[PDB]
Amino acid sequence: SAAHKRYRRLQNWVYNVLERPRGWAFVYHVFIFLLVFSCLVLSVLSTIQEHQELANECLLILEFVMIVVFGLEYIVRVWSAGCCCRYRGWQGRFRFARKPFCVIDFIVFVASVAVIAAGTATSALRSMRFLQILRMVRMDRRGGTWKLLGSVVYAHSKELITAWYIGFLVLIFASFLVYLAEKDANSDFSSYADSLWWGTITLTTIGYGDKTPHTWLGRVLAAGFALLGISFFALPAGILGSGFALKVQEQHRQKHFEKRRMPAANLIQAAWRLYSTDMSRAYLTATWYDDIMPAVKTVIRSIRILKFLVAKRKFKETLRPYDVKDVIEQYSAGHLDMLGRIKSLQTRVDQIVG
Amino acid sequence: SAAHKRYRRLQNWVYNVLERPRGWAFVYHVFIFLLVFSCLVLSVLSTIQEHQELANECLLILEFVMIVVFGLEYIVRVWSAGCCCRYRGWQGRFRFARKPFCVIDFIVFVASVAVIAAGTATSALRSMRFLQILRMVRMDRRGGTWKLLGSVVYAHSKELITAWYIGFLVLIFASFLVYLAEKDANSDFSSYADSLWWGTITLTTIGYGDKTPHTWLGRVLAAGFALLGISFFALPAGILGSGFALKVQEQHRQKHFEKRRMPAANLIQAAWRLYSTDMSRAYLTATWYDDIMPAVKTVIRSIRILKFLVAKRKFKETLRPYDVKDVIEQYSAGHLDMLGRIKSLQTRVDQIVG
Amino acid sequence: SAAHKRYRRLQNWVYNVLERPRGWAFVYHVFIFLLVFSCLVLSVLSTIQEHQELANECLLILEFVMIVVFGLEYIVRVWSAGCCCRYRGWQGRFRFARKPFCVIDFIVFVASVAVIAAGTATSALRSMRFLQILRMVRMDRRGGTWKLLGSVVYAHSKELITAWYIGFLVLIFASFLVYLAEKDANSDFSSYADSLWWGTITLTTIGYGDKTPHTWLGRVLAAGFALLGISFFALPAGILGSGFALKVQEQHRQKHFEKRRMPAANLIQAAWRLYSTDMSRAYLTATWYDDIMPAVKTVIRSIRILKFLVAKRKFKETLRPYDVKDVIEQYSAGHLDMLGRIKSLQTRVDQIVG
Amino acid sequence: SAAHKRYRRLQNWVYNVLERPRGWAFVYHVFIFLLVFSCLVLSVLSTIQEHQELANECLLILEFVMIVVFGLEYIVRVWSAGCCCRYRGWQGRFRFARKPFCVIDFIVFVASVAVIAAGTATSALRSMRFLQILRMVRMDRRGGTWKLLGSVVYAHSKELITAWYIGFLVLIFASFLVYLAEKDANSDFSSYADSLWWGTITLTTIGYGDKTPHTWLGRVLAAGFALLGISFFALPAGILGSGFALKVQEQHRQKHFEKRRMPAANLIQAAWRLYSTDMSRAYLTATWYDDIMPAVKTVIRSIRILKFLVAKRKFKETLRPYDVKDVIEQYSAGHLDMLGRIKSLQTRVDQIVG
Amino acid sequence: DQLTEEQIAEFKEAFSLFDKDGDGTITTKELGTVMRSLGQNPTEAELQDMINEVDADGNGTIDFPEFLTMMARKMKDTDSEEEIREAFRVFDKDGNGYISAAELRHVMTNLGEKLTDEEVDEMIREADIDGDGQVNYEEFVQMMTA
Amino acid sequence: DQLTEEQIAEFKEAFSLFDKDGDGTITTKELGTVMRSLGQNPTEAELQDMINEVDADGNGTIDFPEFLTMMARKMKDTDSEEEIREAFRVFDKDGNGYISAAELRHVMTNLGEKLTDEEVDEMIREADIDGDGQVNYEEFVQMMTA
Amino acid sequence: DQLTEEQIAEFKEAFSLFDKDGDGTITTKELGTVMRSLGQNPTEAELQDMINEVDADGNGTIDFPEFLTMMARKMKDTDSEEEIREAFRVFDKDGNGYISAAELRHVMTNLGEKLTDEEVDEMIREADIDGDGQVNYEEFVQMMTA
Amino acid sequence: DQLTEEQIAEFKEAFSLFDKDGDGTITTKELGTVMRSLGQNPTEAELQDMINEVDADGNGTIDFPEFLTMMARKMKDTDSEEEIREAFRVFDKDGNGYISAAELRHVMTNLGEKLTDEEVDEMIREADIDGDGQVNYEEFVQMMTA
């Protein structure tokens, strides 16, 4: 079946490059990226009334190439999933197709093909070009980015609220004070809404320049308020950046410990020992041939099941992190064992000599 | 009294959702927020001369709804406070009302009602719309944000002062140097005050664009000073952000230790044991029936009071943080106890055999 | 001499409030600050041709008040220095005056008085108003800010150098590329120097708006370069901020240890014991009355000098920080002492019983 | 040969100042920097049509001086390389010249000389002035900056990707929403491309001011979107700065440990002991004069080679970092040795007395 | 609850059981001797901690004014009410001022100086337990501080 | 694989070897006694861990319903399949679902409760090893979970 | 205070009590022997530290030039005045150059090589204590450095 | 320096002193026995480390091809020259490729497996010391790697 094994190795390699890339497999995904992103850009260049002609021309070719490439990729991935043992036979392939992102990719492809077909309602045929962004959104494996951002935001919720509350009060105050000074002299600050627009555009440090204070009082107040206001607005970015950095550092820290080890290795052993209870040559002897006292072998199996369950638990626990108080715990164990050893010496000296 | 207990549970639930929210109770507070904030926005849209009509219309309805909702909330909270044992009876309700933020909320509500009544001095009836911001200010439970900001600012005083001193010097020098170069060619830099305004608006990175250097010397001098100046102005934000992040991390650190534990549990026990001295069946026997030697039971109670006071202290202390030198202390205790054990062996061997 | 001691306490209090403030003494220095800074502002308002009249009026009064206040402060500080024992008598006062910042303050005061006198060359009488900034520069006690900034910059030299080298390369390349595209269509980019000015003003995120790309190639090229360029330019403000924060945290860390302790206390004791060799009642006995064998007391003194010198060294060393490897060192000492104790048991058992 | 040793010391000093500067040697390199950078600036001032005359004049002199200085420096460095033992004789000098940056410097110099010669195609003679930037690029010793930046970027890949993905989605959305509101009223937002240009220029906080929202709906949407958008765009700069700071701190941490020590010292000893097997006076005796049993000395040498190889390995290993679990390992070793010691006591007591 | 003179005399008679010599002070010797006569076995460090809680002079003794103050006060002070209530709140994660009867039972018999079953039975009987099985501990704290 | 009544009776007969007194429970005494009769030597802490894996009542015993559940289930549950597959993945750095025969042999005989040579020989024989010498462990996991 | 020749001869006579053999050096043997004759009991490590403070040659000895320098200097040098003043400042939190008589007494008798009551009584008598009970320690440092 | 056949035979004769049985291998027994006969006293862990440096088969032995490779190579390889030069550079703070004769003497006799005085005397004699007293260690490394 050497050909069968070559087939299986090819399948596993393709599935590895598609589902979970590593090392050089990226050279594929990046490509796909630059293929969709590029298309997006062209779509935007279609909106300008100056380049519409050439842009539509290029978009025709690019959409054709993209539809062909994504159809090929989809067929290849659906065939590759077969490598794993979970999805075998056409029933298994179907079970694979039922995944959400798979049907998403299929829907996007069928939409692209139907659009290019109807091309031969141009407004809708242009509007659906936004669909490609779903091809990128599909790159998120279970929304990792959203979950990471949410975790980091929640961990610093108290610090973030303080920056917004202090920043909002300064914007409401500085806007009011500057509006009070520029009310009549300058025409820009006709109403309070204009003052608030100016205050936001200034405190964020955007500084469009369509509204600026003209009288000296307004300038002094603006300069004094901007220094206090600019720092509060720029805090969230710094807080979140330091949070991300510290999180990455601590995580990388735990990589060195490698404490889980031994539990995973023992679990496979307890599972093999349990499994082999029912097929090992160790039980294919006249002695074991079950007819007179079946319970003996059943009792031996029951013990292996209990040990398997202990090993599965110890294995699952390894994932959980451990504290730095273990050193105190080993001293407690070491001292207690030694103190008990001196007692056992003391009792024997007192027994013999008295 | 099952109905009485249902009543008490309802009261405690309402008081929990109002005073100290957790989990899903937030779905209430957020609502109130979006109800006041929205009103604020409408008030601002009243200032524009274009939308005044529709804005006042909407503000009428929104003020009506807000007054009704806040009256309901206030009555409900005043009735809910009764759940706790501190404020019982109408005397207790009154004691509850005497709180500062409660009277604040009441004053704001009465002001809103009086305003809407006088509506049927419109300038003042518009001016008092600012009052609602107090409804948000009321969300601060004892000014937590101010205290946090003050702590973090005080802990980093030296670096912060260094950033301002270097930043102030650079600003003065750059403004003067650029004014010396742009004095005659450009009309913007007519006086030193204009140069200072330009220097601030540039170094903060706002960049309005109403004043810019025109001669090449000014540009070169402005370019170099701008690069050095921009970093110093943004230094505060980064310092405070890193400070907040590090503080949050270290605080989260101490949460894992949970060292306080045992003291709180023992305090309740010493308090119960002291209390039960005067009501336990253990003392309702012919033996204890006090007539011949009252002092014996009094002495037993005096001992329980002393132990209660020891447990209260140990309980208060647990809140205080503990150092990482405890491991050295346990080794010192462990070594000393063991070294004393070998001495006790040595003395007994020397006693019997000599 | 109770009056003498009241005098000395008053002197020490004044000198404490002036030289090294703490707690509430700040309420003085801040005042002086707001007194000089204010003056500065008025000077600037003198440059405008609109407010010159009122500004000069206010500056007259403020300069009078400032000269009087600083003369009073200088006399008070020169008299207060006498409290310490270093500068006693008029020779000591003179020695105090010889300090650099003292003569600086004196020169500034004499300059102010000479200026106000010549007031009754107005250009110079206005130019010297810059002198007041020296009053603030004088607030630096031995240039602490400069030394702190230099330390933090030197510790991070490599990372800071990387940000400038990458940022400079992005600036050159982006300026050249945008100039190549905007050369003919737009008039702003007439020469490469204009492109470099635009590139700096954009990458620093100032964005004056006097130069902007007009053709789409320039716009797409500028948008891509600005995203890469903006992060590198703002990279230094973040590195230095994180450095300051980490430095403050680690420093605060060592404050908790308080490992220096015991050495300072022992030094005073060895110094007192050495000093008392030559005046203690312990040596004023017939026995010690020196005539027959003077060397005995000299030898006793020589030993106390050697112990004093050991205590002074151990005291100076405490200032130096200590590593976290001490726990390993105490285990090494503890294990070795215990292993030697079991050997001493083993040898005695082998001696008696054999 | 005292003159020979003076020669060698001079050579080593020059090579130290050139190849690897330290301390005061920098006072040279900085100079060279200010000599090339200055030239660059002058070249730029040549592009302006106002200063071309004086700029070309100054550039002539500066190019002459620079060519002379760099020729001198190159000859001196090529002669200095001889100090090391690797490159000796003209063959060794040649081997030194074959280095990449050496030939780079030589090519740049020959290009400068050929240009100044052809000066007596001016367009090319101006274009090649860009070459000098290679003189700075040459300051990178094996592209340290690029490698550092790449390491820090790769370590923070997951955090960086989240900022880009969230930021890209906000930019696509805010631009579309603002374009929908400003479509007809304002002429700036004629097409979607204009809205995207505005969105980028706004979110990066550049704020040119050539495009701004005019209707109030657009202003409100721009205000809310910019606050969310500005933080995400500045998130990458915040993450890389904290990363650099943390990396520098941890690196400085390992400097204090100084754990490598002992291995380097032992390696030199094992190498000397092996080397001296074949030349020591210890082997120049009648006993060792090899004729009857040569293998004895060969066996002794084979043992020294094996020990040398053990010492070389232990020396290379020291460079690798070590974990903080060593304390647990020393307790394990210490406890085990002591527990075995109590066993040896127990067995001897049981042997003699029984 | 003004402290009366007969109440003072009864405290004095208890104080004199400790200070049998009439020296006006209670040291670790006098305190620990009375305690061990009743079958208690405090350590020396526990006797020092107990005396230190009321020894303002810091000389290792309790005098009658300190003894009388402790006896008159018991747990009625506001510091005691707050700290006891803070101890219950350690075990109230909901923050609603309630603790389960079964959770109170676990903490009382499994942590610290564990209550016996009969002690904890009397404690749960004394709290007016709700029908669910939840205890409002803040009214439990006021009964011990009354 | 519906659990039949004869299968239940065979489990009951094994359960009764442990619980020879007919008390309906297996403690560490009954479990450890049967184990040591076969020449095994568990520790007390190992006997407690084993019973704790199936003791829902938390009273340190196994009753027949818990015994029957464990015996009927073996490793067929989805939790077992996932955790065993996660254990192999610890040693699959490529992430391709493969492990070398020689690497499996090293881990099985050098880590944990090491397999003997004959045990590990039977294990590698049972996996359908590819011609390269690489083992697809996810189909190995389904054979032990079937 | 120029060092005179008679003062040098008196130092020489003390130096010769240590170096009784006339070898011109003081080792730990000579130093420790004289010290123990007076009833002191330094350790070997304390004798090495003492000699190391004045042994510039680093060979574990004190010669007469080193002995004479130490004896002529005592505590009069500026390094001694500064370090002693820095030690007091450890216990001056106000930063005003004052320390309480009672705080000085606590530190002198409770930390380090504690002073006896009589030693510390003489020390507080010698400082010109103010009527409040506060000690200006910087003038106390100049009296020991004079 | 092509390895000749007579040089190979002399290595073979040394190899046979270790492997006296003719088994073609050197274990810790054979290596340590020859070493102790010369009065050396390696530990078992030191004998394992030595064999492990040249045992490619990982079975705890040295065969003749491994022995011959080690003997032919000595320290002449580029890895040896670089690592020895890196070891000197640990003690060259200036970075100029020099080390003081007195500093070399301190490191050789005070760290590691200290050289005796006579060993270190021969080492400093062999380096062509400059008149200042500074040693160019990179030419010292080439003499040991030649």
Ligand SMILES: CCOC(=O)Nc1ccc(NCc2ccc(F)cc2)cc1N
């Ligand atoms: C934490 C709240 O935010 C700030 O601390 N803001 C801030 C304060 C000062 C400076 N330095 C420039 C300067 C200082 C004083 C002057 F009088 C004029 C200019 C910069 C910032 N960003």
Ligand SMILES: CCOC(=O)Nc1ccc(NCc2ccc(F)cc2)cc1N
């Ligand atoms: C700590 C004080 O603040 C700064 O370090 N400022 C700063 C310095 C340089 C750069 N890199 C761009 C650049 C470098 C060299 C040039 F010649 C032209 C441009 C950016 C900033 N922000």
Ligand SMILES: [K+]
């Ligand atoms: K900006």
Ligand SMILES: [K+]
């Ligand atoms: K801007």
Ligand SMILES: [K+]
């Ligand atoms: K602008």
